[PDB]
Amino acid sequence: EIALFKYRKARLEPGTAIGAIGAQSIGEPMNVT
Amino acid sequence: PDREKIKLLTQATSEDGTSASFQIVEEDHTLGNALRYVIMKNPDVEFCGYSIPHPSENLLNIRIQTYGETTAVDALQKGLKDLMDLCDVVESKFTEKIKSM
Amino acid sequence: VKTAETGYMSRRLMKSLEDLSCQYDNTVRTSANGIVQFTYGGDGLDPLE
Amino acid sequence: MSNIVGIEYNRVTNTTSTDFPGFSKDAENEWNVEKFKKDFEVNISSLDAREANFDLINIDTSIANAFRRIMISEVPSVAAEYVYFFNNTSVIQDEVLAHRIGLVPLKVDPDMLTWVDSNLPDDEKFTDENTIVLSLNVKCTRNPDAPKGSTDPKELYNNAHVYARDLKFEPQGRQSTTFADCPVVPADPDILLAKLRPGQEISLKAHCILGIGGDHAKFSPVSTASYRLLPQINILQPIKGESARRFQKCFPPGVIGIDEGSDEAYVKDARKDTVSREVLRYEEFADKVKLGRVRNHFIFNVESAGAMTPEEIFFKSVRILKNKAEYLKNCPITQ
Amino acid sequence: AGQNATVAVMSYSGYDIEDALVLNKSSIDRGFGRCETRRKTTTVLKRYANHTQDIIGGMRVDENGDPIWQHQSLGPDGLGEVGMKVQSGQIYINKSVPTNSADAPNPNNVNVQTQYREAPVIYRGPEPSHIDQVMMSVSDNDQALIKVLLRQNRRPELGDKFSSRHGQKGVCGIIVKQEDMPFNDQGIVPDIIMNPHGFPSRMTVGKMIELISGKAGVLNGTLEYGTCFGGSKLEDMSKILVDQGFNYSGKDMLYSGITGECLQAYIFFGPIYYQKLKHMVLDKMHARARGPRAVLTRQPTEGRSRDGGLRLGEMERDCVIAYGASQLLLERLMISSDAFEVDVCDKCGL
Amino acid sequence: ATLKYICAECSSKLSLSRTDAVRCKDCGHRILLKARTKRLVQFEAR
Amino acid sequence: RDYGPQEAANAMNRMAKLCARFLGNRGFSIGINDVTPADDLKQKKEEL
Amino acid sequence: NGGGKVKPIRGFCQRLKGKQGRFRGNLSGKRVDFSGRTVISPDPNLSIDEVAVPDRVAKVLTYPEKVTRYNRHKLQELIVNGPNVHPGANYLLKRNE
Amino acid sequence: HYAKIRPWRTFRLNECVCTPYNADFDGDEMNLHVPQTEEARAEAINLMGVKNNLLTPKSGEPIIAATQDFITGSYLISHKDSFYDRATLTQLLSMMSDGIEHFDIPPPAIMKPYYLWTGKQVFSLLIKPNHNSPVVINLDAKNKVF
Amino acid sequence: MIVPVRCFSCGKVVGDKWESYLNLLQEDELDEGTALSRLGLKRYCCRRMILTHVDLIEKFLRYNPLE
Ligand SMILES: [Zn+2]
Ligand SMILES: [Zn+2]
Ligand SMILES: [Zn+2]
């Protein structure tokens, strides 16, 4: 009940904007670069 | 007979003595710390706490959640007048000595 | 100066991606409704929760 | 633990009261009195007119701590607050000058007045036996006597230093006739309010009014009040001889004392030490020594502004708390 | 520049937290850290080609014996005077200029060269100031020039930058009353009361020595030298302190500001020199409801001073998109931003 | 005095007419300041 | 991740509103000897 | 003319182009009304999910309200205080707009 | 935020939410907004609001938590070497939630050598203060300095 | 500008002492703390302000509007 519950309530539900959260998400804050 | 001094908080308390939360307006840790020590040495008394919500305003919560047997307010009354007896005993001894120097 | 470039990088990095959302097909699409990815991360599951 | 706080180099131990029958399988010391009444005692160190010191015993932290609190804050006192000026030319900004006045003590017996209403306006506010007001005006006068240069700017300029003694008073109807034996006096009559030089003058009258110390220190009758919590040094083994004579130089002068080399180091008295604890810094005195201070015992002293006698301060302070609890019980609680 | 202020390093009054200092009433009441704040506003008085000066006229006094409150900010001179509380909305100079002053004069005049549009400047601000000094004087071109200075003292209210002069840059936290925060033996109560956590990560022990040196110097009755690779060293202070009875570690017990019991760990406290800064909050706090709009873009004006409005930058804006709030944009970037209705034509949209 | 105001340097009581000039008399020095009002004024120290 | 936010963050607020007094009441502070190395280690490092 | 080479003859493609130039910061970046600015200070006994907003800005910081039904017995009073004291309002807008 | 009005003048938040803003206090000047239209309100509070966003997405982690004092403070009450008696624990549990709550006291951590409770308990009640407290938790992990 | 009549901690009256102090330093030059110690200053926070507070009013009265 817990496992499959959380797993089901863990999903992208439509309308949440991923691209934005990714935008916000990446930037902050022998020789190779 | 000023209706604003303390108020029974129905929010916190349940029934029948036990838990009672009394917010004292216009008072401070003087009476709170002074009083808790008294209260707790009443046998039925179990949890007598107090705190200010925040110094940012003057309100003082005092707290007694106790057993059955006697009732919440009955404690605060009893040990409170006991804290009166403190005051008398204090001036009793003190002013005795000082007039006797 | 690194914080300077980094801020800029957040601006632009947004821009190209600035609009991307998830539709009721579990299919992330853009706006004009070309499809970028079918099942998000092959998962469809919010990294948050 | 036995009313003695654990004292260690890196920490302190054994704090909260712990006398109540909550925490003990043997439940004892449940309130009452008599055990306390007959048990509780007190001592007096000495008194001044303007300062007091004494000893307290056999009570908890709280009620004493309250006494300190209600003392430094709640005990009412009378001081200048509202300020009137008839011009001024002097160098101090009239703001600061004002803030200087009321912040000075004034020796006058409170309870010779009442409290003032916040509500009623204007003349209703400051009234007779509920109120005091004082005034001072001085124009500096260049002294035609100038024996030398760079002398005191009095030998230069008469009354160029305003003192508290300079502060005079206007009595009023029924206000005059009542204080004839007790005229207003300003604490230390010598205090520098301002400096100035001729061609300069200050004229003012500001109301001295009852107030409560917690709101402003200028309402504190008490310069400071504290209970120095009495230390008890406990000693172990004869540990006598040379390094025992050193052992007192470890501490402040009075401390213990050296009776004889064979008679080692005996405590003269406690309370003469700051508990500065450096028997714990050298550490070779360690196992043969321990430290402690006693919960049940209170060194206590009060620096009062000199307004009233400090014995009156502490004595009143309790009665204010009596008034508080008595006042409270009589009021029923709303539901 | 500063106060020499006693402090006790401690996390007391959890209002403290990060870098945020916290203070003592009945000290601020006693005159701790107080600041006279002076400003000046000049008003140039120049003659205009119509040959009519800009005039100081004032003192209305309707109502039988008093000038109206708004206009009651003076005396018969018609200009500000010394020693007056002035509440915003009042006149600290009354400047009457001719509304015809800029007109083209002709080789004629008869009676009235008045026609004054008077623009007295009004003290604006949250809190009363004082005019204690003013100057009527002339510039080089022989014209009337008036300069006034306004001042207000600021009790150090909550939210003031206080430098610890050692690098600790912090806001004054929630002002304690008196009893709260400790007292100890002689009853000496610290003034500033400061978080320890600054010292570990900011990793500055210099101050931590400075406090020692401070409690020292007073006790020997000296100022205390310190300088780069120099000044009084530390070890000497130990004996310097212990003889007079304070722990050489520079620490002492204190007692609960509230509870009144012993504090469960020795506290390092004593004298430190602090100082008060610009960026007083009362200057800085800035808010509007509906403020002016700028003619060109028809929307809130720029920054503080003139009047308000605040900046949603793009980088600031898009943060809302990650929450995907439709309406919050509209109310925010539209309904409360520039409220407008365009009228257009389906055919040939314009 | 209860007359208007004072020099900058010469520092002496002086009045003035309306629309005359700012130069003092005792001194040729131009700038001058305004005396504090004889009117009452009030604070509250706290 | 269990009981949802309203009671979750409530656990926080009771956390802080505890600490902000308790930390203060007990007291915590630094002291020189904690920073000061005491004899000993200075000899070790001094060789190191 | 002048002709000491006054630099910014430019008025236009600029005013539309960068930074304070409209189409970014003055349009997508609009500087928006109904706001406020101050320094900070900690308040632990304040719950999380709040901010202590000082009364003095609340006096000038206003919120639009369409009275209804339940509202009067609050709102009918909230006027009687007026803009001066905090638990009050200032602007009113009738149904007749 | 739900806004509560208090005296003086400044913005005051709960320090545990500093880490999102990384606000050092000091000179930091926040930007305070109120919305106007209704739907934007319920939008911001009941979506963009704190409690909902209590986790930060990128890490899938609860960005907001105690720092500094509240951590080290906990570390003292949590500490094994600590104890508390009937009084000390009482006034604490009070000061933990200023009032407002019924409670229950688990059996004392010790016995016939007096009675006490340890921090681990008195903190345990911080999670589950009452009977009716729906916060039954098991937990385990390494902290640092292990 | 002139010694605050009370300190920032004790708030024991300082005012009398400054003059008596300063004189006691000039007349009969003597050790600072000891002076205060036999002037009756004990508490160091009380003490700092006599050991400190450079007087600015005397250096001001050089400048005055009136002369
Ligand atoms: Zn058309
Ligand atoms: Zn002249
Ligand atoms: Zn002092």
UniProtKB/Swiss-Prot annotation, chain D:
The modification N-acetylserine is found at residue 2. It holds the Pfam family RNA_pol_A_bac. It is found in: Nucleus, Nucleolus. One of its GO terms (molecular function) is DNA-directed RNA polymerase activity. InterPro entries: DNA-dir_RNA_pol_30-40kDasu_CS, DNA-dir_RNA_pol_insert, DNA-dir_RNA_pol_RpoA/D/Rpb3, RBP11-like, RNAP_Rpo3/Rpb3/RPAC1, RNAPI/III_AC40, RNApol_insert_sf, Rpo3/RPB3_RNA_Pol_subunit. Keywords: Acetylation, DNA-directed RNA polymerase, Nucleus, Phosphoprotein, Ribosome biogenesis, Transcription. Component of the RNA polymerase I (Pol I) complex consisting of 14 subunits: RPA135, RPA190, RPC40, RPA14, RPB5, RPO26, RPA43, RPB8, RPA12, RPB10, RPC19, RPC10, RPA49 and RPA34. The complex is composed of a horseshoe-shaped core containing ten subunits (RPA135, RPA190, RPB5, RPO26, RPB8, RPB10, RPC10, RPA12, RPC19 and RPC40) where RPA135 and RPA190 form the DNA-binding cleft. Outside of the core, RPA14 and RPA43 form the stalk that mediates interactions with transcription initiation factors and newly synthesized RNA. Belongs to the archaeal Rpo3/eukaryotic RPB3 RNA polymerase subunit family. This is DNA-directed RNA polymerases I and III subunit RPAC1. It comes from Saccharomyces cerevisiae (strain ATCC 204508 / S288c) (Baker's yeast). The lineage of its organism: Eukaryota, Fungi, Dikarya, Ascomycota, Saccharomycotina.
Swiss-Prot record, chain E:
This is DNA-directed RNA polymerase III subunit RPC2. The chain holds residues 751 to 1100 of 1149 of the full protein. Present with 1950 molecules/cell in log phase SD medium. Component of the RNA polymerase III (Pol III) complex consisting of 17 subunits. Transmembrane segments: none annotated. The gene is RET1. Zn(2+) binds at residues 345, 348. DNA-dependent RNA polymerase catalyzes the transcription of DNA into RNA using the four ribonucleoside triphosphates as substrates. Second largest core component of RNA polymerase III which synthesizes small RNAs, such as 5S rRNA and tRNAs. Proposed to contribute to the polymerase catalytic activity and forms the polymerase active center together with the largest subunit. Pol III is composed of mobile elements and RPC2 is part of the core element with the central large cleft and probably a clamp element that moves to open and close the cleft. Belongs to the RNA polymerase beta chain family. It is found in: Nucleus.
UniProtKB/Swiss-Prot annotation, chain F:
GO terms for biological process: nucleolar large rRNA transcription by RNA polymerase I; ribosome biogenesis; RNA-templated transcription; termination of RNA polymerase I transcription; termination of RNA polymerase III transcription; transcription by RNA polymerase I; transcription by RNA polymerase II; transcription by RNA polymerase III. The chain holds residues 25 to 70 of 70 of the full protein. Keywords: DNA-directed RNA polymerase, Metal-binding, Nucleus, Peroxisome, Ribosome biogenesis, Transcription, Zinc, Zinc-finger. One of its GO terms (cellular component) is RNA polymerase I complex. Its main location: nucleus. DNA-dependent RNA polymerases catalyze the transcription of DNA into RNA using the four ribonucleoside triphosphates as substrates. Common component of RNA polymerases I, II and III which synthesize ribosomal RNA precursors, mRNA precursors and many functional non-coding RNAs, and a small RNAs, such as 5S rRNA and tRNAs, respectively. RNA polymerases are composed of mobile elements that move relative to each other. In Pol II, the core element with the central large cleft comprises RPB3, RBP10, RPB11, RPB12 and regions of RPB1 and RPB2 forming the active center. A zinc finger (C4-type) spans 7-27. The keyword Transcription applies. It comes from the Eukaryota. The N-terminus is blocked. It is found in: Nucleus, Nucleolus; Peroxisome. Zn(2+) binds at residues 7, 10, 24, 27. Present with 907 molecules/cell in log phase SD medium. The keyword Acetylation does not apply. This is DNA-directed RNA polymerases I, II, and III subunit RPABC4.
From Swiss-Prot, chain G:
DNA-dependent RNA polymerase catalyzes the transcription of DNA into RNA using the four ribonucleoside triphosphates as substrates. Largest and catalytic core component of RNA polymerase III which synthesizes small RNAs, such as 5S rRNA and tRNAs. Forms the polymerase active center together with the second largest subunit. A single-stranded DNA template strand of the promoter is positioned within the central active site cleft of Pol III. Belongs to the RNA polymerase beta' chain family. Present with 6020 molecules/cell in log phase SD medium. The gene is RPO31. This is DNA-directed RNA polymerase III subunit RPC1. Component of the RNA polymerase III (Pol III) complex consisting of 17 subunits. It is found in: Nucleus. It comes from Saccharomyces cerevisiae (strain ATCC 204508 / S288c) (Baker's yeast).
